[PDB]
Amino acid sequence: GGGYGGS
């Protein structure tokens, strides 16, 4: 799986 975060 995988993902991200940011802003």
Author numbering: 234 to 240
The article reads:
As a control, we also determined the atomic structure of segment 234GGGYGGS240 by X-ray diffraction. This segment does not form fibrils or hydrogels and thus may not be an amyloid core. Indeed, the structure showed an unfolded conformation with no fibrillar packing.
Extensive studies have identified that many RNA-binding proteins, such as FUS, hnRNPA1, and TDP43, largely contribute to this conditional cellular compartmentation. These proteins commonly contain low complexity (LC) domains that can drive the full-length proteins to undergo liquid–liquid phase separation (LLPS) via weak multivalent interactions. In this work, we directly visualize temperature-sensitive amyloid fibrils in the liquid-like droplets of hnRNPA1 by transmission electron microscopy (TEM). Our work bridges the liquid phase and solid phase of hnRNPA1 and illuminates the functional role of reversible amyloids in the assembly of stress granules and the pathological risk as intermediates en route to irreversible fibrils.
